[PDB]
């Protein structure tokens, strides 16, 4: 009900796909859950041109990859190729980002713009991601990240209300 899905956005595999309350799918989004399921958290803002593709078929005899996930208050930036990443709640994904195979994003993370998280890259909680090759830039503040996520959730709710159908 509360989830504002855009008209230009596409959600392939509706049974596999999953959208929590107060969600926001921007225009030209692609939540392709044909092969596997895609779980979106509450108050999660998926920005425009975001390719939400399923990680694996989940039909492998041994060591099948985890389909998709997204914690609450997840600020997914525009043009972000989210694939096979278990995003912890309050994860701030950067613009033009790229998630790897079975990448574990921790709580209160801050992915930089134009980043590339590699396969099986376990990011630590309260830490800014940086570099061309994934690495720890520095420890992030708890109060500043929570305030920015609250402001982003309020702004997305206003755009969710009007001008989309």
């Amino acid at each position: 009900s509360g989830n504002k899905v855009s008209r230009q956005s596409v959600l392939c595999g509706s049974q596999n796909i999953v959208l929590n309350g107060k969600t926001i799918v921007m225009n030209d989004c692609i939540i392709r859950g044909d092969l596997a399921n895609v779980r979106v958290g509450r108050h999660c803002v998926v920005k425009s041109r975001s390719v939400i593709r399923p990680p694996f078929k989940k039909f492998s005899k041994g060591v099948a990859f985890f389909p998709l996930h997204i914690g609450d208050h997840v600020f997914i930036e525009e043009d972000c190729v989210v694939n096979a990443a278990q995003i912890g709640s309050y994860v701030h994904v950067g613009k033009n980002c790229v998630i790897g195979r079975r990448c574990v994003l921790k709580d209160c993370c801050k992915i930089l713009d134009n980043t590339v998280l590699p396969p099986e890259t376990v990011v630590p909680p309260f830490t800014v991601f940086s570099g061309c090759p994934g690495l720890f830039s520095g420890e992030l503040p708890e109060c500043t990240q929570e305030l920015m996520i609250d402001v982003t959730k309020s702004y997305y709710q206003k755009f969710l209300p009007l001008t989309q159908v």
């Binding site: 044909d34 092969l35 078929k57 039909f59």
Partner: peptide, 10 residues
């Protein structure tokens, strides 16, 4: 090919 076959089957 196995992933595409599973996607085609779905």
């Amino acid at each position: 090919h196995h992933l595409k076959k599973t996607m085609k089957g779905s």
